[PDB]
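Example complex used in Figure S2.
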Amino acid sequence: VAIRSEGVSETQQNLEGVENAMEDTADSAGDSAAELETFSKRFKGAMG
Amino acid sequence: AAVSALAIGTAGLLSQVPVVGEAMGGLGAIIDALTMKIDEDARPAVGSF
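Predicted assembly (97 residues):
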């Protein structure tokens, strides 16, 4: 009999899923920084 | 950095060398009066004719 263990032991995974999806949102939000300095440090080429 | 350096290189030199064309142009043009005065001394020889 394993009627209880099957229902709970998935949620321990779902917890890590929430956290790893949060990390994904943070790492993906990091894309908004990826070429940021990369444009601005070039841009004095415009002024020159 | 390199394109601004190139830009500054061209800006600094074009505001120099062809503007500095005033050197060859100026000291070239000024040959005018300082050849010319061979005329003011030409008349003295006419006075000696």
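Chain A touches chain B at residues 44-45, 47-48 (CB under 8 Å). The two ends of chain A are 77 Å apart (CA to CA).
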